[PDB]
Amino acid sequence: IVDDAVIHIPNNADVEIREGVGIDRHFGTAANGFKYSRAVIPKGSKFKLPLTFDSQDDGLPNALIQLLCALEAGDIRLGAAKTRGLGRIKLDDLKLKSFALDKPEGIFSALLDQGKKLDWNQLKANVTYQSPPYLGISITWNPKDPVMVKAEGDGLAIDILPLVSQVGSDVRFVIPGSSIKGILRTQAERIIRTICQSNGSEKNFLEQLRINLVNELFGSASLSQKQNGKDIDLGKIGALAVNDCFSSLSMTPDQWKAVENATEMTGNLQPALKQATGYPNNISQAYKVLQPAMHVAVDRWTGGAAEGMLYSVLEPIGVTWEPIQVHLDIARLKNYYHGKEEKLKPAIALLLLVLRDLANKKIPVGYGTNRGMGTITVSQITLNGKALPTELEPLNKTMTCPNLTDLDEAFRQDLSTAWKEWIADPIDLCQQ
Amino acid sequence: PLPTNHPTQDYARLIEKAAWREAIQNKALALASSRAKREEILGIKIMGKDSQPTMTQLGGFRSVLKRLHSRNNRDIVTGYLTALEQVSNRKEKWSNTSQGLTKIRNLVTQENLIWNHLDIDFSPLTITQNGVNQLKSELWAEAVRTLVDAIIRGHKRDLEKAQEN
RNA sequence: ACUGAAACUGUAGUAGAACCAAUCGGGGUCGUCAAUA
RNA sequence: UAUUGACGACCCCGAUUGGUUCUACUACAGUUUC
Ligand SMILES: [Mg+2]
Ligand SMILES: [Mg+2]
C-alpha cells in the first residue's frame, strides 16, 4: 500500500519555472511552436515514504528488501523528464514497524502500542544489493568562454542574466540537463546524418529529431502507427539521462535578488555583485567572477551605434562548475535490442564519438555560443560502469586524452569495427 | 452562508477557490475571443497585418507580469512601465495602441479594476460569509495574470489570421 | 393472514515519451544649430 | 549683395517562437446461498 505524500519545499524556497525550447536542427534556431515551460519542485524538497506491506508469509520478501536498498541508493526516479534532469529521489531515515496481526498480542499492538521496531541494518546485512547495468560518465570541465544559460526574461541594470536555481539554503548557477542533453543529441544526429549524407532541411522539427541510434540513446516521442496492419508505438524513453549541473559558487537567495534588482550598472549593481561574488570590498576580484559587458550594434553607413541597439550581459566569466553527470542505462538499451549485446557497440561507438567532440571544443553549451560564450575545456572524462557485459568491461576508465586514446586500442578498434559495419548498412538496430 | 465560526469554514474555502479559479479562467477565455475587448482591456489592436504593439512588446510585458505573485509585487510591474515610459523609442512603440500603457498601469495598480473587466457574478460561487471580499483580495494577482495571459494568446492567434490573408 | 436475511462499485494501471531558452548585433563616434542685415 | 557667432553629446535594448505530436480508458465480476 502506497499513500499520498505531501511535498514540503525548503524554507523560503518556492516552485521554479523551467523554460524549454526546441531548436530546429537545420537553422539552429528555436522551432516554431516549440516553446514551453515547466514548474518543478526544487532540489532538496522532502516528502514522507508511506509504505505498508501485508505479509501472508513469514519474514519480508527479499525483492521488497532490494527495493528499499535501491531507494536508499537513490536508484529510483519519479515523475516527468526523467532523462532531462528531473526526478531523482533518495531515501533517508528508514524505519520499520512490524505488527503481528495474526495474534492477540499483535492485533492489540496495532490498536494501541504502535508496533515492534526492526533494525533495518540487520536486514540490510542479509542481502547484496544488485545494481543493474549502467555506465556513468563524469565530465570534468571549466568554461573557456563564459558559459551560461539565459534567465527567463530581461533584467533592469543587466538585460541578460544567468539562470540560477535553489539548492537548499543557497542559489547556484545551473545548466539544466535539458540543455546538456540537447547539445549532445544535436551532435549525435549531425554525425549520423553526416555519415549517411541525409539532409535535414525538408523535415519539420518532430521528423528532424527521429533518426537511427539516437532514437534509442536519446529516445523518441510516443507515436502510435498502424505500420503493418499491426499497430505499433514508435515511442521509447531515452536510455541516456543527464543531470542539472550547478556552479561551485553559491549565493544566498537575497544576495542574488540584489543582483536581479540592481538598476545602475555603475551604481547599486556594484555593491550587489561584490556581495554575491564573495569579494564585498574588492570589485576588481568581484568582476573576475561575474563581469558586466556592454554591446552595441553599429550602423553600417554612419558608424556610431544603431538607435536602440544597446544591451548588456552579466557574463559569468569566472564561475567554476561541477563535473557533468551522464547516466547511460545499459539495461534499457539491451532490452531495446532484445538482449543482443553485439548491438550495443554501434550505440556505444556513437556515444564515444560524441564525447570526443565535446572534449575537442566542438560542442559549445548555453547562450550566445556564436557571440562570445559557451566554449568549454574538458579536463577529464571518467567512465564508471557497473555490471557491464564482459566485452564492454574495458569502458571502466578515467580518460584525459580528448581523443579517447586512454581506451584500449583493441577495444577502440573493436568498436570501430562494429560501428563501420553499421555504417555499411544503417538498419534500425532494434528491429528484431 | 456558513457562519464565520463554523468548523467547516476552512473546508468550504477550499471549494470556493476552486469554483472561483475555474470561473475566472473560463471568463478570461471568452473576453480574449473578441478584438474589441482586448482593445478595451489592454489597448492592444490589429491594424492590417501589423500588431500594436509588436508581439515582442507584449511578450516583454508578460514576462514581467509573471513576477506579480501578490499585490505587494505591483511595484515590480509598475517599475517596468515607468522605465519603459522613460525611454522615448520604447514608449513610442506603444503609440497607435488605445492608451495601452496607462491601461496596463491601471489594471495593475487599481485593485478593483480586474473584477470589473471580468464581470463575474461570484454570488453562486461563494458560501463562506465574507467570502467575496476575502477571495477577491487573495485571487487578485492570479486573475490579473490569467486575464493578461488569455488576452495576449487570443491576440496572437487572431494576428495569425490577419497575417495569413 | 405480516418488511427476507447477508453482500465495500471494487481489483490491476508512474500524466508520461520526445523537445538546447535560443538566434542576430564591434561599447561605438564630428558638424551641426539659430536668421537675418 | 553675404554676412552674424561658438557651442554640443547620443543610444539604454530591438525582432521572434509562447507550446507541438502520441495515448483518451483497457481487462473484468452482471448476481450470490454445499
Ligand atoms: Mg536598462
Ligand atoms: Mg539595454
Tell me how far apart the alpha carbons of residues B90 and A308 are, in angstroms, rounded to a whole number.
9
How is residue B102 written as a grid cell? Answer: 496607462
Angle at A73 between CA A72 and CA A77, to 5 degrees: 95
Tell me if A388 sits within 8 A of A133, measured CB to CB: yes
SS (H, E, C) chain A: CECCCCCECCCCCCCEEEEEEEECCCCCCEEEEEEEEEEECCECCECCCCECCCCCCCCCCHHHHHHHHHHHCCCCECCCCCCCCCCECCCCCCCEEECCCCCHHHHHHHHHHCCEEECHHHHHCCCCCCCCCEEEEEEEEEECCCCCCECCCCCCCCCECECEEEECCEEEEEECHHHHHHHHHHHHHHHHHHHHCCCCCCCCHHHHCCCCCHHHHCCECCCEEEEECEEEECCECCCEEECCEEECCCECHHHHHHHHCCCCCCCCHHHHHHHHCCCCCCHHHHCCCCEEEEEECCECCCECCCCCCEEEEEECCCCCECCEEEEECHHHHHHHCCCCHHHHHHHHHHHHHHHHHHHCCCCCCCCCCCCCCCCEEEEEEEEEEECCCCCCHHHCEEECCCCCCCCCHHHHHHHHHHHHHHHCCCCCCCCC
Query: Smallest Cα–Cα separation from B148: which of B71, B59, B47, B85?
Result: B59
How is residue A424 written as a grid cell? Answer: 555499411
Query: Smallest Cα–Cα separation from A336: which of A347, A325, A326, A327?
Result: A347
SS (H, E, C) B18-43: HHHHHHHHHHHHHHHCCHHHHHHHHC
Residue contact B60–A154, C-beta within 8 A: yes
Q: Which of residues 61-120 of A touch B (CB under 8 A)?
A: none
For strands A310-315 and A291-296, give the pairing.
antiparallel
Tell me how far apart the alpha carbons of residues A279 and A283 are, in angstroms, rounded to a whole number.
7
Proximity of residue B97 CB to strand D below 7 A: no
Q: How far is the CA of B84 from the C1' of C33 (A)?
A: 30
With a CB cutoff of 8 Å and minimum separation 6, the contacts of A378 are A139, A140, A141, A358, A359, A402
CA distances from A385 to A135, A188, A326, A388, A390 (A): 4, 21, 11, 6, 11
Tell me how far apart the alpha carbons of residues A424 and A254 are, in angstroms, rounded to a whole number.
58
Query: Smallest Cα–Cα separation from A175: which of A363, A311, A397?
Result: A363
Tell me how far apart the alpha carbons of residues B161 and A38 are, in angstroms, rounded to a whole number.
29
* Torsion (CA) A89, A90, A96, A102 in degrees, nearest 10: 30
- Please list the residues that pair with B45 across neighbouring strands: B52
Q: Is B54 on the interface with A (CB under 8 A)?
A: no
For strands A134-143 and A324-328, give the pairing.
antiparallel
Tell me how far apart the alpha carbons of residues A138 and A326 are, in angstroms, rounded to a whole number.
6
CA distances from A324 to A14, A180, A365 (A): 25, 9, 12
Q: How far is the CA of A323 from the C1' of C12 (A)?
A: 42
Tell me if A152 sits within 8 A of A321, measured CB to CB: no
Tell me if A374 sits within 8 A of A328, measured CB to CB: no
With a CB cutoff of 8 Å and minimum separation 6, the contacts of A178 are A18, A20, A81, A84, A85, A242
Nearest to A308 among B64, B66, B89 (CB): B89
Query: Phi/psi of residue A107, each to 5°?
Result: -70, -40
Longest CA span, chain A: 96
Tell me how far apart the alpha carbons of residues B30 and B116 are, in angstroms, rounded to a whole number.
15
CA distances from B19 to B13, B123, B134 (A): 10, 11, 14
How is residue B163 written as a grid cell? Answer: 497575417
Q: Is A58 exposed, middle or buried (0-12, 13-18, 19+ CB in 10 A)?
A: exposed
Tell me how far apart the alpha carbons of residues A323 and B13 are, in angstroms, rounded to a whole number.
48
How is residue A100 written as a grid cell? Answer: 503481528
Query: Smallest Cα–Cα separation from A151: which of A171, A124, A128?
Result: A171
CA distances from A431 to A86, A336, A337 (A): 30, 9, 8
Q: Which residues of A touch B60 (CB under 8 A)?
A: 153-154
Give the resolution value in Å: 3.0
CA of B12 from ligand 2 middle (Å) equals: 49
For residue B116, how many other CB atoms are within 10 A of its CB?
8
Tell me how far apart the alpha carbons of residues A400 and B55 are, in angstroms, rounded to a whole number.
48
With a CB cutoff of 8 Å and minimum separation 6, the contacts of A420 are none
Query: Smallest Cα–Cα separation from A38: which of A5, A9, A81?
Result: A81
- Is A350 annotated in some ligand binding site? no
For residue B127, how many other CB atoms are within 10 A of its CB?
15
Tell me how far apart the alpha carbons of residues B117 and B37 are, in angstroms, rounded to a whole number.
9
Query: Smallest Cα–Cα separation from A161: which of A340, A291, A14, A19?
Result: A291
Tell me how far apart the alpha carbons of residues A356 and A378 are, in angstroms, rounded to a whole number.
10
Q: Is A264 on the interface with B (CB under 8 A)?
A: no
Nearest to B63 among A153, A156, A307 (CB): A153
With a CB cutoff of 8 Å and minimum separation 6, the contacts of A240 are A83, A181, A184, A217, A218, A219, A326, A327, A328, A329, A351
Q: Quick one: closest CA in A to B82, which residue?
A: A156
Tell me if A384 sits within 8 A of A136, measured CB to CB: yes
Proximity of residue B145 CB to strand D below 7 A: no
With a CB cutoff of 8 Å and minimum separation 6, the contacts of A269 are A157, A158, A259, A262, A263, A292
Tell me how far apart the alpha carbons of residues A380 and A382 are, in angstroms, rounded to a whole number.
6
Alpha helices in B6-94 (DSSP H): 9-32, 35-42, 55-65, 74-85, 88-91
Task: Determine if the peptide bond prior to A292 is cis (ω within 30°).
Answer: no
Classified as helix, coil or strand, B1 is: coil
Method: cryo-EM
Tell me how far apart the alpha carbons of residues B44 and B30 are, in angstroms, rounded to a whole number.
16
Tell me if B78 sits within 8 A of B109, measured CB to CB: yes
With a CB cutoff of 8 Å and minimum separation 6, the contacts of A371 are none
Q: How many Å lie between the alpha carbon of B115 and the closest alpha carbon of chain A?
A: 27
Tell me how far apart the alpha carbons of residues A90 and B48 are, in angstroms, rounded to a whole number.
57
Sheet with A324-328, strands from edge to edge, namely A240-242, A324-328, A134-143, A376-386, A397-399
Tell me how far apart the alpha carbons of residues A275 and A270 are, in angstroms, rounded to a whole number.
9
Q: Is A17 on the interface with B (CB under 8 A)?
A: yes
Tell me how far apart the alpha carbons of residues B132 and B136 are, in angstroms, rounded to a whole number.
6
For chain A, report the end-to-end CA distance as a whole number of angstroms: 38
Q: Is A153 on the interface with B (CB under 8 A)?
A: yes
Tell me how far apart the alpha carbons of residues A386 and A407 are, in angstroms, rounded to a whole number.
17
Q: Which of residues 101-160 of B touch A (CB under 8 A)?
A: none
For residue B164, the one-letter residue type is E
Tell me if A218 sits within 8 A of A181, measured CB to CB: yes
Tell me how far apart the alpha carbons of residues A113 and A118 are, in angstroms, rounded to a whole number.
15
Tell me if A88 sits within 8 A of A75, measured CB to CB: no
Q: Which of residues 64-83 of B touch A (CB under 8 A)?
A: 64, 66, 79, 83
**Sign of the torsion angle spanned by Cα atoms A333, A336, A341, A346:** negative
CA of A262 from ligand 2 middle (Å) equals: 13
